[PDB]
Amino acid sequence: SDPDPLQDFCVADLDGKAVSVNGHTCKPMSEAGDDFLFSSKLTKAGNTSTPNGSAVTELDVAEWPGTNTLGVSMARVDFAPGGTNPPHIHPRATEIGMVMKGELLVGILGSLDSGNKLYSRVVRAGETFVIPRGLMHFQFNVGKTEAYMVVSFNSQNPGIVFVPLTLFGSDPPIPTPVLTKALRVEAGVVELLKSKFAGGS
Amino acid sequence: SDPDPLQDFCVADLDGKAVSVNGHTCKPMSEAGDDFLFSSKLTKAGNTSTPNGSAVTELDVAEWPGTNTLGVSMARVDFAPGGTNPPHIHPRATEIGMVMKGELLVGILGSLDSGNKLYSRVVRAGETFVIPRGLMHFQFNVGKTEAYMVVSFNSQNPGIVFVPLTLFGSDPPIPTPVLTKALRVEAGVVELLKSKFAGGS
Amino acid sequence: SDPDPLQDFCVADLDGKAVSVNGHTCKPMSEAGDDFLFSSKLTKAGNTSTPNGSAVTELDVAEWPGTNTLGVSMARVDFAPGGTNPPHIHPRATEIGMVMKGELLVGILGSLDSGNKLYSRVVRAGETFVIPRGLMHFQFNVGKTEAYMVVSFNSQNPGIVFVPLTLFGSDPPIPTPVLTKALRVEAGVVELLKSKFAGGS
Amino acid sequence: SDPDPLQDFCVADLDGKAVSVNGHTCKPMSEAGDDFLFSSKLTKAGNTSTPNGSAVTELDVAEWPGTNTLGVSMARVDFAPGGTNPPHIHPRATEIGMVMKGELLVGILGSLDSGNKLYSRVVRAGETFVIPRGLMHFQFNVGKTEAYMVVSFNSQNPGIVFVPLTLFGSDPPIPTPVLTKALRVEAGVVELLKSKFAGGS
Amino acid sequence: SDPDPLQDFCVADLDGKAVSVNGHTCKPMSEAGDDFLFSSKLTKAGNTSTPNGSAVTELDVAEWPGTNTLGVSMARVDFAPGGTNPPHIHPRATEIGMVMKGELLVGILGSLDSGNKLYSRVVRAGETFVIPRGLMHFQFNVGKTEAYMVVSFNSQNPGIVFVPLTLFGSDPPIPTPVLTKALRVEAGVVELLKSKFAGGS
Amino acid sequence: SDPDPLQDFCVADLDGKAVSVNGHTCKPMSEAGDDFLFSSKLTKAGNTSTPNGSAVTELDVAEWPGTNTLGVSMARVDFAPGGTNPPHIHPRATEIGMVMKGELLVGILGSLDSGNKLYSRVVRAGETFVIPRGLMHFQFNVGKTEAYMVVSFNSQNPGIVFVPLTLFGSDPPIPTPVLTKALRVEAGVVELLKSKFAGGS
Ligand SMILES: [Mn+2]
Ligand SMILES: [Mn+2]
Ligand SMILES: [Mn+2]
Ligand SMILES: [Mn+2]
Ligand SMILES: [Mn+2]
Ligand SMILES: [Mn+2]
């Protein structure tokens, strides 16, 4: 997991010309003020008018510099009815979270040696789930109203590997002959899928 | 931080006669069922009729065996008006959390080389805070109704070192001559403090 | 990464009734013999007559018990002409590898904050590549003869999340309405994809 | 624990205008000289004429730049007769130490799930003790002459959270209503305690 | 082991005047190009016309900046007939490797509590070995033609402590009276050994 | 470094038939008694009437079960006049230590990329030194009376790789043709060296 901190605080210096290191350099401690350990960025719902029908509001180190070196971050995800936070992976963190409003089908997938088992259930207000680092998972709003969840991670920068977007809409996209071989369908089907993700999100 | 996992899942075997290891041994994977990655233990408010005026509902590995080896846990804390989650430390984890209802004065204290600085603010619904591993911190309900927060940690077993209870009500209590020297007050004052914590909580 | 070792050697006890822990318990050191630090399991090519046209020969702790606690493993991957080791992720390890024979298009994909960038090139005998933990990647045999590579990981059990198989052929498969929403295509297309992975591999 | 080193040596650059990172940047290796792996800072006793009756002489990375990245530090603590190194916590390290002269009552406190157990004994010359990261502990000179101990930590910067000073004399102090609720005594008692720590140490 | 990465990529900035940190600072991500995850440095055999009769071709972070923060590296070692990669230690990594051509006697030595056991066998093409961090080991070409192996490590900078060269040819060499006491032979024998390593390699 | 602890205490179960894991299983916490965090094993000097002229008194987890999982250990080393703690390596820990009595030449050696630099000085009572994990180092008593030092490590089981004993007296010894090639001397010289270490210490 993230390297442990070597002092109490180390607020990220996010200036575009800052020297680059693993993670982030820190602003001078003397200059951090009083408020770096607090945020209000998750107070409002994200805009669910997206192709997925969900919206992630990030609270990782990029959005909350006071988390730098501390080995934690958060996010909020809002869902339109029938919206999905699509199959995805966090490459660098375990996730733990709670549904706050509505009803979400939450699915978590084992790796090959676990038989690619799918564990899923309908998670309601106050109920929680845990997703091991690197494993594919999704949420789907099965309710008829807006749902949201609040999640936390054991990294300052868990990363998101969105499976559909990466598979079909990477920069630039994976070669069609790779995808036809991998997906066991003809070029036309792969081309249809790519056309859905050609817009970068 | 907690050792990284060496497989997808490793549900804690919490049987009283289980062999003991760092953390917990795991139940046979073949026998875990479908539901170990989920919990509903935080759906209900804790009982705030306590001397502190707060109640912690734990969701660490002892309460959620499916978190074993995954490097995360959660808790809910409910507060009566004027209730406090008193100055305390988590010896093995950074904490990250959100106020869900009400208004909480949240205070976080730097260590000696940080001048023992106190950072505090009133945290309201949807607002968040982060507390580095090992640092003293508290919350106090400044509202006139019940408040609660939901918190997460980057350990399966963060630990709680309650400062008042440990200082005055440990098992058995710290010697009075140690406390008079350390607190710079006479025996009578130390004896008064001990009398408040003689009941073990 | 994997927990560091706390002694020189700790050969995995892979008996089916062994107590379960994070990773593996160890056989009594006194009884390990001379040969646990060696293997010959990668001397022979895997069978490439598979739907993917590739075959992975594993040398993780399950196949090489002497690697237990040491934070490393290996594998060999053989490729028929036009064969692919399809888009996949190792949830718990960085991979580093070398092409030994033939010509492989090797592609490595950044996460969302890296713009899902695809980095790819044709890798020939003696040439190497590195794949950060948790990131999607693939190889495709662009040559007209059999190719193989030998790879190593900084985990005893890196895991494999095969993207096509997990997305369409998990146990049981992800719900069609989740996949239609996530992939932005009609049910018929999702059903076609599922039919290709209904056999478990 | 502290991040492992990625090279042999990395002597801390402690210049006030140095770029800030987790831990410390390093001076150019070419310029470190011969003597960075050695110190003589603990050769002399600290001044025990303090309110606590003890004096800590630090040998962390701030005082010994050659320890930077190496995951270790030291300190010496000297005690007047009846002096205490008061209840405190090291947020980022386990401590291991030896009494060198005199007789010290050494107390170590478990966390809540350990029942806040107090383990204590009189430790004499050559005898040792170990204090897990984050746990409250103290020493008290029970002898009639000066005592000292030498301690080591598995961090370059373990931190010190002094319980009395932080509880009553932080910068600025914890609110009286928080302390009256937490300590179960009236304002007058809290005000008396604060008056003892108003001087910053 | 090496600190985990806190982002996808962090290509090492190896400029001689770069600020120094544990490991390496990184070049601006925006400027890394496409090719940093690939190398061709191990395509050619090293020059075995050396006193050892072996040649190490390094592929650590100094030679492959794209490995920075990723916790892995590689090397190739080529051997003349009768050549040795002499008893040595990697202070910061476990090694895992495969013989590619020829026949190598590979020996791995336990530490004191393992009775300094020597485990050795003749390793041929395709066969593998694993060497725990910090343990002494060697390879010796027992064949009549050139051999080579390709090895990987779970560090970006494993380090090499060559035992003969360090014992007899360090900068400056270990004092003769230290070596006579340690090796239980007279000065003349130590002086003979030093004369063989006076050239720095 | 050693895996972090997942609870307050975990006293090692050192029974010969205990299940084996990375490190040690723990005795039931309920049964540990009061005294596991303390030891008196270093109160007395070791017997310096040895070929080296030094004696190591170990206080690792094998000798101090209460250190299990806590990431620290200690040792005492006593030296006859002219005695040496010979060139050796700790494979799994950084060492930090203090001379308590007498005068010791302490030498610490960089790895290859550090030019195999030797850093050495005469260390007297109260003076300290630090030795990075995996690096060769030695001490030599330059005084005319007995010296001793007390050292600590950031591992519960640092290991000791004694260079002379391992090079010449391993179990069984390294082949003579390996040593003649590696040491650049004739068989007779290697045979002389082996004869000095044929007794196992
Ligand atoms: Mn997620
Ligand atoms: Mn807390
Ligand atoms: Mn792969
Ligand atoms: Mn302390
Ligand atoms: Mn090697
Ligand atoms: Mn040593």
Residue D22 C-alpha, separation from nearest chain A C-alpha, in angstroms: 6
When scoring D6, D15, D22, D60 by the number of chain A Cβ atoms within 10 A, the one with the most, hence best to mutate, is D22
Of F124, A9, D111, which Cα lies nearest the Cα of B115?
A9
**DSSP summary character for residue A12:** B
* CB atoms E86 and F181 under 8 Å: yes
Structure token pair of residue B185: 């007050």
Q: Map tokens 């030194």 to a residue.
A: F129
Q: Map tokens 């190889």 to a residue.
A: C139
Q: What is the DSSP string of E29-86?
A: GGG--S-TTEE-TTSS-----SSSSEEEEEESTTT-GGGTTSS-EEEEEEE-TT-EEE
Within 8 A of E92 by CB-CB distance, chain D residues are 4-6
Within 8 A of D69 by CB-CB distance, chain E residues are 22
Which ligand has the nearest atom to the CA of D133?
Answer: 4
- Which of D91, D133, D192 has the CB atom closest to B189's CB atom? D192
The whole-angstrom separation of Cα F137 and Cα F116 is 11
Which ligand has the nearest atom to the CA of C89?
Answer: 3
- Which of C4, C8, C26 has the CB atom closest to F21's CB atom? C26
Of F96, C28, E136, E149, which Cα lies nearest the Cα of D63?
F96
Side chain identity at residue D44, one-letter code: K
The answer for C185, left when phi > 0, alpha when psi is -120 to 50, beta otherwise, is: beta
Q: Is residue C25 within 8 Å of C11, Cβ to Cβ?
A: no
Q: Which residue of D has its CA nearest to E161?
A: D8
* CB atoms A28 and D21 under 8 Å: no
Side chain identity at residue A85, one-letter code: N
Q: Which residue of D has its CA nearest to F76?
A: D126
Residue F62 C-alpha, separation from nearest chain B C-alpha, in angstroms: 16
Ligand 2 centroid–CA B53 distance in Å is 15
The number of C-alpha atoms within 13 Å of D153 and in the hemisphere containing its C-beta is 26
Q: Which residue of E has its CA nearest to D30?
A: E16
Ligand 1 centroid–CA D135 distance in Å is 34
Using CB atoms within 10 Å of the CB of residue B30, give its burial: 0 to 12 exposed, 13 to 18 middle, 19+ buried: exposed
When scoring F30, F105, F119 by the number of chain D Cβ atoms within 10 A, the one with the most, hence best to mutate, is F119
Within 8 A of A28 by CB-CB distance, chain B residues are none
Q: Write b or e for each residue in C138-164: b if 16 or more Cβ atoms lie within 10 A of its Cβ, otherwise e.
A: bbbbbbeeebbbbbbbbbbbbbbbbbb
Residue E138 C-alpha, separation from nearest chain F C-alpha, in angstroms: 9
* CB atoms B39 and A128 under 8 Å: yes
Of D7, D74, D23, which Cα lies nearest the Cα of E2?
D7
Ligand 1 centroid–CA A89 distance in Å is 6
C158 Cβ neighbours under 8 A, 6+ residues apart: C60, C73, C90, C91, C92, C93, C95
Structure token pair of residue B130: 């982060």
How many other CB atoms sit within 10 Å of the CB of residue B138? 26
Within 8 A of B155 by CB-CB distance, chain F residues are 6
- Gaps (C–N > 2.5 Å) in chain D: which residues precede them? none
Method used to determine the 3D structure: X-ray
Strand order in the sheet with B137-141: B118-124, B103-109, B137-141, B84-89, B161-162
Within 8 A of D1 by CB-CB distance, chain F residues are 1-2, 4, 71, 154
* CB atoms B8 and A96 under 8 Å: no
When scoring F2, F139, F183, F189 by the number of chain E Cβ atoms within 10 A, the one with the most, hence best to mutate, is F183
Q: Is residue F196 within 8 Å of E183, Cβ to Cβ?
A: yes
Residue F6 C-alpha, separation from nearest chain C C-alpha, in angstroms: 12
The whole-angstrom separation of Cα D56 and Cα D115 is 30
Q: Which residue of C has its CA nearest to B21?
A: C21
Helix intervals (H) in E98-148: none
The answer for F114, left when phi > 0, alpha when psi is -120 to 50, beta otherwise, is: alpha
Where does chain F show beta strands of DSSP type E? 38-39, 54-59, 73-79, 84-89, 95-101, 103-109, 118-124, 128-131, 137-141, 147-153, 161-162
Within 8 A of E69 by CB-CB distance, chain A residues are 22
How big, in percent rounded to 5, are the helix, strand and coil portions of chain C? 15, 30, 50
Q: Map tokens 């999607």 to a residue.
A: C136
Within 8 A of E157 by CB-CB distance, chain D residues are 6-7
Ligand 4 centroid–CA D97 distance in Å is 9
Instruction: Give the N- to C-terminal CA distance of chain D in Å, as an integer.
Output: 28
Please name each of the domains of chain D with its CATH number: 1-201 (2.60.120.10)
**Facing residues of B150 across strands?**
B76, B98
**Facing residues of C26 across strands?**
C12, F20
Residue F149: C-alpha distances to residues B78, F7, F84, F135, F144 (Å): 53, 32, 12, 19, 16
- Which of D2, D20, D21 has the CB atom closest to A4's CB atom? D2
Say if strands D161-162 and D103-109 run parallel, antiparallel, or are unpaired: unpaired
The whole-angstrom separation of Cα C166 and Cα C20 is 26
Q: Map tokens 């059990």 to a residue.
A: C157
Q: What is the DSSP string of B104-153?
A: EEEEEE--GGGTTBEEEEEEETT-EEEE-TT--EEEEE-SSS-EEEEEEE
The whole-angstrom separation of Cα A61 and Cα C149 is 37
